[PDB]
């Protein structure tokens, strides 16, 4: 099954949610953003020294 949820951008902040399906016990779902990795695209221009 597929479930949608919004989470803050932050580490060490577990977020808990449930999924509702008839005849199925609500299933605990824990989501943790372990870390972030912002990697941009860059080009080498020149060097100096």
Partner 1 sequence: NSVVVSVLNISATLGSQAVLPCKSYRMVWTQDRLNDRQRVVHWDVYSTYYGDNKMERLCDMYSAGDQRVYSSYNQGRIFMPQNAFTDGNFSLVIKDVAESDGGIYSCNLHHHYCHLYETVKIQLDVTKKAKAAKEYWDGEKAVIVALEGSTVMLPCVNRNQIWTERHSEEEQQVVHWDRQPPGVPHDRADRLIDLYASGERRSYGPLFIRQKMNITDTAFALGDFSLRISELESADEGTYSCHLHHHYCGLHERRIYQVFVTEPV
Residue 34 or 49: which CB sits closer to partner 1?
A: 34
Residue 22 to residue 1: CA distance in whole angstroms: 12
Shortest Å distance, C-beta 35 to partner 1: 6
Contact 1, 13 (CB under 8 A): no
Shortest Å distance, C-beta 21 to partner 1: 25
The secondary element (H helix, E strand) that includes residue 19 is strand 15-21
- Does 35 participate in binding partner 1 (rule CB under 8 A)? yes
Tell me which residues touch partner 1 (CB under 8 A): 34-35, 37
């Amino acid at each position: 099954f597929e479930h949608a949820t919004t989470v803050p951008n932050v580490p060490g902040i577990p977020y808990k949610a449930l999924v509702e399906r008839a005849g199925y016990a609500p299933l605990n779902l824990e989501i943790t953003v372990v870390s972030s990795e912002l990697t941009p695209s860059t080009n080498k221009e020149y060097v100096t020294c």
